[model samples]
Each structure stands twice: as C-alpha cells, then as structure tokens.
Target: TKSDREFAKLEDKYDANLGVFALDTGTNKTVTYHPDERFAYASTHKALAVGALLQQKSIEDLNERIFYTRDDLVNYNPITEKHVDTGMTLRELADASLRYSDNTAGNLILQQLDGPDGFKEALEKIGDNVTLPERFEPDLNEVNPGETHDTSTPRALAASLQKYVLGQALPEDKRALLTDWMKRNTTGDALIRAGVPKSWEVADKTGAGSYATRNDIAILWPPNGDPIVLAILSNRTEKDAEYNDKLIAEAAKQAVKTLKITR
Candidate 1:
C-alpha cells in the first residue's frame, strides 16, 4: 500500500529519532526514538484528565455544563475564531481541549477535576511520574519550574490507549463514550491521520508547544483493528513545526501499513 511505502521512506529518512509502535490485540511491535525520554505536554495531557474523569465518576450526561469567561480565554486568533464562550459543558470543554488544543478549556477541566492536586493524584494512579503544576493561570505563557504537567513514555501512553480500547480498565459505557469523543477530535495539524484515507475513522489526541522544547501525538485506530500509538518528542530547534508534524504523520501511516502487510 502507498501508506506502507511512505512509512518505509520515513523510516529510511528519519530513523533512530522517530518513535513508532503498533499492535494487534493479540500481538505488538515498537520502534523508538528516545522512548524513555520525558517531554513537556503542551495540551495532550487533557486526554489523561478526560480518561481519569470517566474512570472516576459517572456523569449521566456528556454535556453537563462547565463554564468559562473572557478572562479565562487564551486570546489567540484561532480560539477567538472558534467563538467558544463561557458556559460550555464538560463534554464540550473536553472536545475543545483536545480538538482545538484550547488551553482555557483544558484549564477549566483541570480545575473541575479537583484542581491540580487531584489531577496529580490521578496521574500517579496511572503509573506516570509526570508532575502537574499547582495551577494553570491563563496569563502565564509557559508552565513554571517544578510545576509542569505530566509526562508519558511511548509505552505508558500506548498502554493507556489500549486499556480504553479493550474496555478492560474502565466501565464499558465510559470507555465507549471516551472512544466516541476521541473519534470526534478534528484537529489535523498533527501526524496520526496524515496517511490514512480521509474516510477512515481515527480517534486520537495531539500535543505541541515550546517552539524548540516539545512536540507529541497519540492515536487509537478504528474498531476491530490493532490500536496504534506514536509519540515523537523533539528538543531540536532547527526543524520547522509543519515539517516535523508531516514527518511524524507519515511515519505513523507507514507503521500501520507495515502491520497490515505483516499480518
């Protein structure tokens, strides 16, 4: 398949530094580019909060209200264009946090999930050593020292996705709801969806920021197939964000294609 050929080219082109992993429920494979290295999670940590919320509490409605105000806004052009006002639901907030990488929405959800202290507890429960800052002040452009958000290895993130996919860790209904929300994520600047046919359903979340500090993407594939999770963290300043994103997307597509061919 074209996807396979593209991925092979990516591997040849960006070997070593690229981390790629794909798995069938019965078997798995992983290729790493600093898999053990920890990087900042600009916005991707929202998914963790979302998962934690689903696992801990049962909100009968996905649309339960979670309010925000102009002061809570990030004042970005894209965010402004989205016209997201205050008074959104928990589901809407989560969707905005993931799909648009809306920082304000993420902060709101973080606050609702028992604030930073509670979020930190949840991360520890999942076996992640990542630290979440005491508070997410909207005016602050970057996280403070010793107050950064959680970090995840490729293996840990993949495991989290697998847990949700198999409906093994969370209640069945919660898993299904999370899976559905993930599929609705429309942000495409990241790599996971770059190579698949547009029609194919891809449920995933992406995180990027700090210019030269960090960039990452994680994805869960369509039903009845092995779930694929790829995390790429780069501290190099020489590369362009658009270029890096495209490279990662192609790598993931190629990895998935390779799995199909081997099968």
Candidate 2:
C-alpha cells in the first residue's frame, strides 16, 4: 500500500519504529502498521486513568477535594506540584491530568482507582483486556529490556479510545467531559493535529518517554464526515534516541490520506 511505503520512509528517516491503527468510522476503512507491537504508554495513561475514574464515579462526586504533599509530586507535574498545600478537587485533578498531562494528578487518580489492578478491571469492564496499566506515572514510563510495564499496542490503544471516547463505555455527559478536556489538550498541537487541516476538530491524548517513545491517540472530525479513530505509537531502538513530533505528524497524514478522508 502507498501508505505503508510512505510510513516506512518516515520510520527510516527518524530511526524509529512506529505502530499505527486508524479507523474511518464513516466507511469502516482501516489502516495499520505494526499494530500489535508494544510501546510505552507514558503520559497517555493519564487519559485512561481519568476515564476510568469517571466510569466508577460521578462528576459531582469527583468534586471532592484530594490533598497531596510534596512527596506525592513527580516530575512534569506542572499542575499538582503547584497546589500541594492548597489541594484540588478530583474534578480539577482530572482536568489537569487530561488537558495538561499532570503527572501528580494522574498518580492521585490512580491511587483512588486502587492502583494498577483496579485500573485493569476498569479496562476489562470496557471489554479491553489488551491495554494494560502496570504502574503509576514516571516509573511506568520506563522501557526495560523485553519487559512491558505500562505499555499497549497501537490496535489496543485505538480500541480503548474507540470504546471510551467514541463507543458506549462512557455515558454521554461523562464522555463529553473527557472529549472536551482532550479537545483542550495542551500537548498534542504538533503531533497528530499538525498532520491534519488546521480547521478540523481533533480530540487527542499524547505521551512521551525514554527511548523516543511518543504516542498520540485521537478522534478526528473531518467537517463533512462522522470521525476517524487514530493511534500512533512509536519508539526507537536506541535507549537514548531523541523524540520527534514530526514523525508522528507524518504518520497521521499517511493514515488520513490512505483513508482518503477530507473536509
């Protein structure tokens, strides 16, 4: 396929391996590349964590305040680290984690979900036993030899996105809350968003980690169509490889072009 050729060029040029899964909800057409390969979930896990929280709790219930100390703060916690003493409502924490990829907020939500085991149950409830959350943030981002802790395949990631974001895994209002937060996400402007037309609406979650592990899963609205579910997961062979958003953008472009989706 032309998409595979173009995507292959991108992987070579970037010195990285990419796993992609794209679904055109309108036509049911699909595109995949190394779809079953595993990659670090990184901050992308925050999106799932928040979604799982909404599955088990209500919006009003999330309003209850959650307090944390300096010890609870992790690197890249721009939101939670700022309000250690003041604390924040679970609602605020969900917003922070989803929209800002707040590490501490994600960890706090995981704590409430009873950590990895409970989070796994939440995924199973959604009929997704493939995507796994093995640990909390920061540490979960590690890429150990032949060990997949906080990792999932592109296909599984996209399926989870389909269920939680587009399917019936979440109720309408709850889904709306997650969708709105993702639409307001501050981190993915240069990733999948850069691949599509500026005017197209996109709700997405992105993640980054060591070994050049970078990912983005999205629900894209091409003005005249229903929508497309796309997930791009990538990593490099070298442990110290540098991260690049351009690779992700081009891969997204390939998927959209293959599907011939247009506004």
For all candidates, the clash counts are 2, 0
Candidate 1, after superposition: displacement of residue 218 in Å? 3.8
Best model number under lDDT? 2
Tens digit per residue, CA lDDT, model 1, 1-263: 46434545664674423444455544566544445545455555667778777766675665677655676666442443354554777776666776776777777777777876787787667665643435463433243333344444565565556665453667878877777767777775466777565656677776655433344456655566665665554333333323356666666666566667656
Cα TM-score per model: 0.74, 0.96
Misplaced by over 4 Å in model 2 are 261-263
lDDT of 2 by residue, 129-182 (tens): 777788887888887646777788888888888888888988999999999999
| lDDT on C-alpha atoms for all candidate structures | 0.59, 0.88
Residue 135 C-alpha lDDT in model 2: 83
Best by TM-score: 2
TM-score of 2: 0.96
Which segments of model 1 are wrong by more than 4 Å? 1-17, 61-63, 75-86, 130-150, 197-200, 212-216, 222-224, 238-243, 257-263
